[PDB]
Amino acid sequence: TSDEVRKNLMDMFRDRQAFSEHTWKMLLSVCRSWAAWCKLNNRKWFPAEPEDVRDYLLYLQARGLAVKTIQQHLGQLNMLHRRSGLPRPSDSNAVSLVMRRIRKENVDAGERAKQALAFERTDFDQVRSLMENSDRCQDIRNLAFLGIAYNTLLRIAEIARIRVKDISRTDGGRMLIHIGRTKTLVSTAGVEKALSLGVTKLVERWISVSGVADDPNNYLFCRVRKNGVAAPSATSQLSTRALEGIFEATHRLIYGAKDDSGQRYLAWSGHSARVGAARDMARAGVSIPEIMQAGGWTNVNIVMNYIRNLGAMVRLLED
Amino acid sequence: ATSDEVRKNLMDMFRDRQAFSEHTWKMLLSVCRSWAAWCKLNNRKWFPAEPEDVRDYLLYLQARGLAVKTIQQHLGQLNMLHRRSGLPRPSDSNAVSLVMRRIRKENVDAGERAKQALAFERTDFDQVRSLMENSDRCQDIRNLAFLGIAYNTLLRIAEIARIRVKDISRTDGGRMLIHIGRTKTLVSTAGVEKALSLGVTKLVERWISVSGVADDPNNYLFCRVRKNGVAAPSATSQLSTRALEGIFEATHRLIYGAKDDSGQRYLAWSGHSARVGAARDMARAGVSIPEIMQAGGWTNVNIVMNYIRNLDSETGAMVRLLED
Amino acid sequence: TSDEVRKNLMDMFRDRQAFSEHTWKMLLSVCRSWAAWCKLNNRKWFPAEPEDVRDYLLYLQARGLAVKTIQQHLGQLNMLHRRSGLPRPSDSNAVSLVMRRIRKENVDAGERAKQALAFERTDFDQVRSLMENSDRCQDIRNLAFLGIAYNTLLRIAEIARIRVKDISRTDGGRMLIHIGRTKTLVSTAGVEKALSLGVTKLVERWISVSGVADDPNNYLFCRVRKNGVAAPSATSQLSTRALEGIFEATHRLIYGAKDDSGQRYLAWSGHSARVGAARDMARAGVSIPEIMQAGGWTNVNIVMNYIRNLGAMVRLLED
Amino acid sequence: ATSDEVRKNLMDMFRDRQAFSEHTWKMLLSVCRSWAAWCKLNNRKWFPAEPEDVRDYLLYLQARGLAVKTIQQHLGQLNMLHRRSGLPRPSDSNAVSLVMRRIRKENVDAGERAKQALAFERTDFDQVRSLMENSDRCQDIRNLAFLGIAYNTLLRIAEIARIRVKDISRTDGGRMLIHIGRTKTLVSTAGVEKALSLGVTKLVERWISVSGVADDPNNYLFCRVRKNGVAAPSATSQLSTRALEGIFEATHRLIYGAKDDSGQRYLAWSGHSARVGAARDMARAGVSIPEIMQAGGWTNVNIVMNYIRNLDSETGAMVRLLED
DNA sequence: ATAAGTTCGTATAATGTATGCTATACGAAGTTAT
DNA sequence: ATAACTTCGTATAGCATACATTATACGAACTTAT
DNA sequence: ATAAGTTCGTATAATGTATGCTATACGAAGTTAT
DNA sequence: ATAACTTCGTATAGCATACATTATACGAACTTAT
């Protein structure tokens, strides 16, 4: 009750670190949204009334937002309440059923959550075939990045977190990248992402022209200014936003500027090589169980999602 | 759980009824009618449902010789009616939990057989193809394209009915592709492409010359053909799934005759036969569990497995070892 | 309370079928035991007092019983109570900890739960090599049984439940045995246990000399009297106790009469071919995932248990 | 939870203390002492433990630079002390749950490294074997047999100490088998047999001529050797695991010298080194994950996996594809 | 007499963990246009 | 004196026993068609 | 001036589900017999 | 009349969306060393 809510909420703010910085950014972005919808209609934003939550989801739906975004708003509200020691909006038929209904009506009109434009071995080979010959710091960095992204399948944020001290060697001379935390795990054991001899070379070239290896505690990737001078750091990472820019720029290099549609995934992006690699592995005949360790997935669906038709019966028949 | 809460819960249900498929509602209504009539008959109250009363009903359903999976559907819908109304579910009562268990146990031990569609394999398509490709009959031509697009594709009945003519291409060689949509999962697919042979694509040509189905593209590929053998396209009505089940039943009668062995199910061919046979054929010629637990969108096994079980290729490692 | 207990217990007896006939036999055997220990010491057997349960387990321990048997007594008592709507003995430190302690002290003195003498391809081949030539009804039956036991790995009770109507054909001519319920599953889908061409023959010979195929609803296996005349039935199964006797007799045939030790597993028994087959599969190089479907196991431990050392390092070293 | 209930719970604990290993009790006592002293120091009550107080302690432990797995052990033992006394566990409080999470998150992001034993691979055994097989020294002879039975076998330290002379055979060729017992699981094993080479079995011969360890069979294979280089068998005392850890540390000093790089762990060889190296060697020559996630009784992976990770044979499918 | 069980009691080993929403099945009753 | 330990205590890496039931193991007492 | 970011907000895709008992680590303090 | 359906209702086989969070997608506003 009131005192208890102030304490539960307060207890949450104290140990903020317990959750991702991003969960907080969304908690707040959703609350900003809901509070706004609430003011305009003179309703109390907290605790939220199921019926109010319901008109809110319907209102997001009418704004033409994705089922996933609508489910994000409901999930943030649910967390605020549950962690508040209060009932969850989803705990009410009104909210439970409207969610189902919005999802159901949205899909049955098409809506499908999207996946990033793939970046496979071919694009890597072509891009490398062209960038290989550059002596520019930016280019050397960007090719090492793409190479690591394709080879390791790590998420951009995990790549930005790599520190020089995290790199080792196999004996065959292959670089070994030690991975601490991921979206799926936060352990002291952790992974050892290995690189192919060619990708190591690539990386090796970047560490060299950049002088990041200066401090072991330095981030593997950093800014590189117009003058071609890198700017190593053990406190600031190269933003995932910039990493996303590498993918976009590399795609703009080969295919030119993008549509005017305003759609997403017109060019490669942070997850392009993960999708792309996962795939390439399927074809090669790699074992799902294997395609899975590559991406660090403890399950089979995403994996399943990334490779398909979206044939065989035409040969039995065809003969 | 207070009748005012319940009344609010029931209005919630009706207000957001689009939360469920109409098939689901149909089943819910059906179970309630059955449950209500039995309560009347037996002098019990049907809402809310009392555990002892629901237990007596589940036994009544078993005594009726219904399938363990059917008794499940009943308890299931009841459980939802109460769960989504604010009352305790019947499944939450010891007596209801115990009886379902026993009943399940008793049935499996009387020989309870989970059935699956009678295969419609290539040997079947060829033979049918044999008795028909030479038929001038508008309905004979149409029913060929169908078994073609059902077998060549493993598409579901509710799925072929949906198909429009504005959904076909010509890809790789007078072949033809059918952009589908055999998913309804948001994080699945948008649609796919199913291709055809000299078998399929062709038959699917004669159906268009005679169906004159392509005159307008909003239309649907498959339409009804009246007694005079005249076609009637439509961008507004699709052939019923019942009608497609008919073409399968009709087709099996032509070869084997009068309804057979009892009043049982799957005595002939049904909507799923084509998908069942396509698989085994695909498993017989050893074709990876990709276009097997996949070709008919089964990103989810036992299915391709319950279908190819009696096959010899799926005999197991013991037979393989015993035989060297 | 009292009324509630009488009803919970009563509700259990009404739908007796909900559980295995064997669970009941043990519920009662344990209660008989506990009630006996209780009378001798003037204690109330129900509800059971943790401290009383504890001296009871210690008393079983002192009688030299197996940890597993002691855990069976505690588990039956726990079920009587839990299903009674009363606390479980194990819900008390006294009972919780004494169990741990008895287990701990028993193992640390050796104790290891045993597994049945294996019956592998070799024993099958030898036994068949000798029995093959018999024209006796008993022998033909017994060889078909052993063959099915080894080939299918089914538990004896599942084998006794096979009915003629359950048998089919693959096309290659191989027999297919449909399995309804197992210890691990009670479903309408169920399994299709296949037999090798040689084992089918064997079976085929038994169905023939026996005339069980007379009624489809007849049990595949039945008694066979001294006069050599089988005795088909669709109501009585050949007891699992007799099936166990086939294994023992076949072993006595080849190796003679058993020890005087009074130990278990001196000869083959109901589970001998399951262990034996599982094993043979390991060696063949069969995939655990495969060794697993054979036995119908939805997990990896038992499977793991049955094949081991209980070598490789002596070649690296040896060279 | 009433002090009379608690007092009964604590007597229950002491009465059936044999429910736990003495190592476990040692750790429990240790955590309590640490928790008690900090409560005193900070003016808090140590029993029962208050969530805010336990949260302040877990932060104190982190500020102390302890490993996330060590803070876990503390909370863990506290949670048990309270669980087995009838009081609510600290882990059951939002504040304690949240802080453990954060702390875990914060640590993994400072580079928290889970360490494993420094390998003691064949290259290591040969080289050591090289610098010693020619040593007359009683202790030099004994320490060879040991690294032999540790590497050739992957047996654990607490395990080789247990070994008796009445546990050896002669099997297949002057070899020798060591019936063990590397299990303590009731539904595991009774014991096993570990075999040896011309490498091992032999060294294990010279240790017996000089140790005169076999004079009586109740004795244990490995014994202490005093400063005069004289042996002292015993059917009653086994070499401490500390002593076996010593032979590993001593041995690495002989080759590399004075304790190295900081006060860190695994700077030299430790009891687990032999099992770590045996594996990689076994993985390097491509030897199935049987005598790999098995040879050292690991019916339970990540172990053989955390050990052979930097290896080239375990590089992954991406490297394999990128390299053709 | 007796082989070949059955039944039964105590003893001990072996094993999974689950649903609930939506489609097809099929006899039939209802509807159109030949 | 120190070598060679053992015992300690705190630190951390490596595992594996509790639920709830369902089944098999085996001697011995009883049952029936020969 | 400006390339090359950073930061930040709204929008939307992607993913696991967990511990707690027992062993080893290692510096050190304590114990024996050379 | 019936063929050829469609609509129904009860029976059953075949699937796949809810949690709780943590992450990426991308335009645009701002920041800094050149």
Side-chain angles (χ1 to χ4, degrees), chain B residues 24 128 157 161 179 225 251 281:
Chain B
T24 315
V128 176
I157 54 167
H179 155 195
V225 173
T251 284
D281 304 341

CSV table of all heavy atoms in Angstrom, one decimal, chain B residues 24 128 157 161 179 225 251 281:
chain,number,residue,atom,x,y,z
B,24,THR,N,-12.9,-21.2,-32.8
B,24,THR,CA,-12.7,-21.4,-31.3
B,24,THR,C,-14.0,-21.1,-30.6
B,24,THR,O,-14.4,-21.9,-29.7
B,24,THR,CB,-11.7,-20.4,-30.8
B,24,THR,OG1,-10.5,-20.4,-31.6
B,24,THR,CG2,-11.2,-20.8,-29.4
B,128,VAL,N,-4.7,-41.7,-60.4
B,128,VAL,CA,-5.9,-40.8,-60.5
B,128,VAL,C,-5.7,-40.0,-61.8
B,128,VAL,O,-6.5,-39.9,-62.7
B,128,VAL,CB,-6.0,-39.8,-59.4
B,128,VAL,CG1,-7.1,-38.9,-59.6
B,128,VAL,CG2,-6.2,-40.6,-58.1
B,157,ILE,N,-6.0,-27.3,-46.7
B,157,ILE,CA,-7.2,-27.0,-47.4
B,157,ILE,C,-7.7,-25.5,-47.2
B,157,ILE,O,-8.1,-24.9,-48.2
B,157,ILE,CB,-8.4,-28.0,-47.2
B,157,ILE,CG1,-8.7,-28.3,-45.7
B,157,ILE,CG2,-8.1,-29.2,-48.0
B,157,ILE,CD1,-10.0,-29.1,-45.5
B,161,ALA,N,-8.1,-22.8,-50.7
B,161,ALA,CA,-9.3,-22.1,-50.9
B,161,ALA,C,-9.0,-20.6,-51.0
B,161,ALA,O,-9.5,-19.9,-51.9
B,161,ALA,CB,-10.3,-22.4,-49.8
B,179,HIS,N,2.7,-17.6,-54.7
B,179,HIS,CA,3.1,-16.9,-53.4
B,179,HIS,C,1.9,-17.2,-52.5
B,179,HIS,O,0.8,-16.9,-52.8
B,179,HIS,CB,3.2,-15.4,-53.6
B,179,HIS,CG,3.0,-14.6,-52.4
B,179,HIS,ND1,2.8,-13.2,-52.4
B,179,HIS,CD2,3.0,-14.9,-51.0
B,179,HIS,CE1,2.6,-12.7,-51.2
B,179,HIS,NE2,2.7,-13.7,-50.3
B,225,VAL,N,-18.2,-25.7,-59.9
B,225,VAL,CA,-18.6,-26.1,-61.2
B,225,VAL,C,-19.9,-26.8,-61.1
B,225,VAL,O,-20.1,-27.8,-60.4
B,225,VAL,CB,-17.6,-27.1,-61.9
B,225,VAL,CG1,-18.1,-27.6,-63.2
B,225,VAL,CG2,-16.2,-26.4,-62.1
B,251,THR,N,-13.0,-38.4,-55.3
B,251,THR,CA,-11.9,-39.0,-56.0
B,251,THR,C,-11.5,-40.5,-55.5
B,251,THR,O,-11.2,-41.3,-56.4
B,251,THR,CB,-10.7,-38.1,-56.0
B,251,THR,OG1,-10.8,-37.1,-56.9
B,251,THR,CG2,-9.4,-38.9,-56.3
B,281,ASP,N,6.5,-39.9,-49.4
B,281,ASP,CA,7.2,-40.1,-50.7
B,281,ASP,C,8.5,-39.4,-50.6
B,281,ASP,O,9.5,-39.9,-51.0
B,281,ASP,CB,6.3,-39.5,-51.8
B,281,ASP,CG,5.0,-40.1,-51.9
B,281,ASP,OD1,4.8,-41.2,-51.3
B,281,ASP,OD2,4.0,-39.5,-52.4
